[PDB]
Design an enzyme around this catalytic site. Structure first.
Site, PDB file in Angstrom:
ATOM      1  N   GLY A 194      11.749   0.455 -13.370  1.00 16.80           N
ATOM      2  CA  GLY A 194      12.540  -0.576 -12.727  1.00 16.80           C
ATOM      3  C   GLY A 194      13.179  -0.132 -11.426  1.00 16.80           C
ATOM      4  O   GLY A 194      12.515   0.422 -10.545  1.00 16.80           O
ATOM      5  N   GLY A 195      14.481  -0.368 -11.312  1.00 13.36           N
ATOM      6  CA  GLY A 195      15.200  -0.001 -10.107  1.00 13.36           C
ATOM      7  C   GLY A 195      15.225   1.483  -9.771  1.00 13.36           C
ATOM      8  O   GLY A 195      15.504   1.861  -8.631  1.00 13.36           O
TER       9      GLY A 195
ATOM     10  N   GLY B  53     -12.359   2.138  17.712  1.00 16.32           N
ATOM     11  CA  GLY B  53     -10.944   2.031  17.406  1.00 16.32           C
ATOM     12  C   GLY B  53     -10.385   3.319  16.836  1.00 16.32           C
ATOM     13  O   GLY B  53      -9.255   3.697  17.143  1.00 16.32           O
ATOM     14  N   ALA B  54     -11.163   3.977  15.985  1.00 14.52           N
ATOM     15  CA  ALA B  54     -10.740   5.238  15.396  1.00 14.52           C
ATOM     16  C   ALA B  54     -10.294   6.183  16.522  1.00 14.52           C
ATOM     17  O   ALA B  54      -9.240   6.821  16.427  1.00 14.52           O
ATOM     18  CB  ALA B  54     -11.880   5.851  14.600  1.00 14.52           C
TER      19      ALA B  54
END
Lengths: 348, 344, 170
Positions: A2-3, A238-239
């Site tokens: 959880g938290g 792009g790489a």
């Protein structure tokens, strides 16, 4: 559970001990038992293994608590106490002059043969020491800390042994996060390049490679600490840009004689480029893969880029350490302008 | 060449030549796909009848692969500024008829220059994309161009609103500047898509065969990847949407969102709203109905409408002032938060 | 071409050629006038004659007036940084043996890049000038190049010391 998982997520690094004394997950398995009927053990759901090798939530996986604490002290040793501090200098960096040869020996005959990129960094940095972050996650990229001439450096290097050095969604997350961290804490960045582009397929597009990949572009363009790119081999599309080039803010760009900077892979380029011209030529098959050799001879080199001023210089592998040392020493006092804002809107 | 009268006539002819882009044949071809030209889209967007273009005659300087012959004025992109609802905004519109709208070095610098101006004066920038990608003919200089624009996207990030209208077939680097802007409005259709790596490569590499639409069509990005923020049916709708989006935003981070069209009163209701929420704690209902009931005239510009309906986010006005709303949607995943939703 | 060991060989040849600038015939002409070459001046200025050079192979982009033929590495100017008396100093040295050291676009952009690096890092800049002027063959692009340098001089004015060595026919 959880938290209890979110504060760690918000911090910079998570070191986790591998063992049954579980680890972490937002929601336990209990609910999966009530509604459905798929019993899942604690380890399978949020074991250190799953988080260090699959989710990327864990940056370091160790086998004991004594190891977690020791690694913590080691990590701390590469970090400044805060924002206004420069990373800590150490082992009287005398071996600053010239790197031990054999470095050019790591890169194989043809770009079809892989090699361990860490072998190259070991030879570049002080005593070959390297603290690898996210070691078992998104292994197609290598990220970690080292010292050059006594000063801490952050490294981003493509790994020819995984997915051929192509960048993935996980790799982009891994490298981009590590880049923003180094910049925030005045740690210089060294980019070692050998990447053919990004991993293809709906699998990557469907999960948003378009936005994850942009994170690397954002991180480097954002960073104002010293940035030097050393192109070892392939640097396509792009790489290429995502590894840090001049227009994106690289302060210095160097290339080994074995580098190949291409707008696209040397085939994907000829197959969109050559047809109307060659589809009708002497031979029907020769001229089919002959021009693929053409491009390489004409562009699969660093000299075309150097002539365009895109690369500051072509160096002998052996010189890499000295080149870095010189560049980093010159950039130590680097200061750059950034537009006022509460913050940016980095893709998530 | 002496008379000035003849000089101006020559100018008029040159500009009329520059405006045609790739020519009447190619624009008709653009039209036959259901697309508008770069300039037609701009005239729609700006208080019709006015656009101030910069570097209109700028051409490519490359010489390889015949580029020394193919000198199209403008190098494939229209850049400048105008008024959108009386407010100053910058924009670029790539012309697909000029070498498939590919990103040339000069092409990139025109876009970069627009961003530099918009950043200096504090004005929004909308990029009407229609590019197949990098100009392969210019090699590495094409990628460097991409880098320069990405640089401007990051520097402008959180300083000036950045909206992209994806109105073309983007591949490779043509995909990243849009990713770096704040909102991506894309039109769905055969002619619109975007992906980092094309299908052709995924074949030889992966071995999988897929269509352009199935790899990166508007639907995949607005409903699965989260890359697209608004999906629309047409270009006219894309630009009307951008005008509406801009109406909710300040010109820059030094201004408060604009106050607008009356029609409040501010005294809320009395009934309805409390009738929507079920008795149970788990039964679903329409959270959007609660938002319409709260905001001015029930208007809500929903962001990422089709992605992670898990949660709802969008713009609206409350008593004339702009607000952003984040609201869990009971109708999807019971309102449980998710990875995609957390990102959204 | 598969031997990397052969690539390091080519590099050394290409650089050997780039250091030559206009060629031995031109360097002897420069010398006959009683002046040193760009690189000789830099070796004298910097400690141990060491200099870290940037954009070593950068060449003109121009094509008109035979410039597509006369494409020398470095485009007529050596730019980079080094230390003088142990302190970091940036500098450019124009090479008269390359098109009369005229100011080409690339040539101007190497000088601008040097100034940007020096200004970002707080290092002085020394300009060993030796050029006849604008590179007529590059037209207005050459003038544009001058303006870019002048702008850097102004931004750097009062921020970093700027020393120029006038060693030519300006």
């Amino acid at each position: 559970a959880g938290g209890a998982v979110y504060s760690p997520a918000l911090t910079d690094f998570i070191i986790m001990i591998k063992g049954d004394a579980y680890y972490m997950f937002v929601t336990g398995p209990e609910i999966t038992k009530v509604v459905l009927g798929e019993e899942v053990s604690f380890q399978d759901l949020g074991g250190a293994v799953v988080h260090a090798t699959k989710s990327g939530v864990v940056h370091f996986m160790v086998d004991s608590e004594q190891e977690a604490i020791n690694l913590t002290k080691r990590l701390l040793s590469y970090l400044p106490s805060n924002n206004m501090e420069e990373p800590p200098y150490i082992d009287t960096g005398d071996p600053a002059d010239r790197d031990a040869t054999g470095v050019e020996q790591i890169v194989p005959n043809d770009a079809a043969k892989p090699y361990n990129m860490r072998e190259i960094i070991y030879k570049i940095v002080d005593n070959g020491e390297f603290l690898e972050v996210h070691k078992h996650w998104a292994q197609n990229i290598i990220v970690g800390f080292a010292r050059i001439a006594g000063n801490v450096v952050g490294i981003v290097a493509n790994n020819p042994e995984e997915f051929g050095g192509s960048i993935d969604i996980d790799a982009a997350d891994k490298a981009a996060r590590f880049i923003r961290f180094c910049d925030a804490f005045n740690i210089p960045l060294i980019s070692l390049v050998d990447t053919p582009g990004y991993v293809p397929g709906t699998d990557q597009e469907y999960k948003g490679i378009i936005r994850h990949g942009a994170k690397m572009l954002y991180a480097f363009a954002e960073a104002t600490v010293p940035k030097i790119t050393v192109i070892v081999r392939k640097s396509y599309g792009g790489a290429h840009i995502a590894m840090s080039i001049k227009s994106l803010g690289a302060d210095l760009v160097y290339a080994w004689p074995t580098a190949e900077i291409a707008v696209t892979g040397p085939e994907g380029a000829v197959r969109i480029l050559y047809r109307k011209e060659i589809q009708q030529a002497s031979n029907p098959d020769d001229v089919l893969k002959q021009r693929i050799a053409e491009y390489r001879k004409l562009f699969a080199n660093p000299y075309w880029a150097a002539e365009k001023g895109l690369v500051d210089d072509v160096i002998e592998p052996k010189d890499t350490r000295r080149v870095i040392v010189a560049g980093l020493e010159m950039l130590k006092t680097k200061r750059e302008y950034r537009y006022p804002k509460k913050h940016g809107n980095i893709p998530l | 060449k002496p008379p000035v009268e003849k000089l101006i006539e020559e100018l008029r002819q040159l500009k009329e030549k520059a405006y045609k882009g790739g020519g009447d044949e190619r624009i008709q071809f653009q039209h036959s796909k259901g697309k508008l030209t770069a300039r037609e889209r701009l005239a729609l967007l700006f208080d019709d009848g006015k656009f101030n273009e910069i570097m209109t005659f700028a051409t490519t300087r490359a010489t390889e692969f015949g580029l020394d012959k193919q000198r199209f004025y403008g190098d494939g992109v229209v850049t400048g500024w105008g008024k959108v609802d009386g407010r100053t905004v910058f924009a670029y519109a790539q012309d697909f008829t000029v070498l498939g709208g590919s990103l040339g070095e000069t092409h990139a610098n025109k876009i970069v220059r627009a961003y530099e101006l918009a950043l200096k004066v504090g004005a929004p920038v909308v990029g009407i994309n229609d590019s197949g990608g990098a100009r392969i003919q210019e090699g590495a200089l094409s990628l460097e161009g991409y880098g320069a624009v990405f640089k401007m996207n990051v520097m402008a990030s959180g300083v000036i609103p950045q909206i992209t209208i994806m109105a073309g077939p983007a591949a490779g680097g043509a995909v990243y500047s849009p990713a770096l802007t704040d909102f991506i409005i894309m039109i769905k259709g055969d002619a619109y898509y975007m992906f980092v790596t094309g299908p052709e490569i995924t074949k030889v590499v992966l071995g999988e065969e897929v269509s352009f639409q199935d790899l990166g069509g508007a639907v995949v990005h607005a409903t699965k990847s989260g890359v697209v923020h608004f999906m629309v049916d047409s270009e006219q709708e894309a630009i009307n949407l951008t005008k509406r989006l801009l109406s909710y935003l300040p010109s820059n981070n030094m201004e408060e969102p604009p106050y607008i069209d009356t029609g409040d009163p501010a005294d809320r209701d009395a009934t309805g709203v409390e009738q929507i929420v079920p008795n149970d704690a788990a039964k679903p209902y329409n959270m959007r109905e609660i938002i319409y009931k709260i905001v001015d005239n029930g208007e809500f510009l929903e962001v990422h409408k089709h992605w992670a309906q898990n949660i709802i986010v969008g713009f609206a006005r409350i008593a004339g002032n702009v607000v952003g709303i984040v609201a869990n949607n009971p109708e999807e995943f019971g309102g449980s938060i998710d990875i995609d939703a957390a990102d959204k």
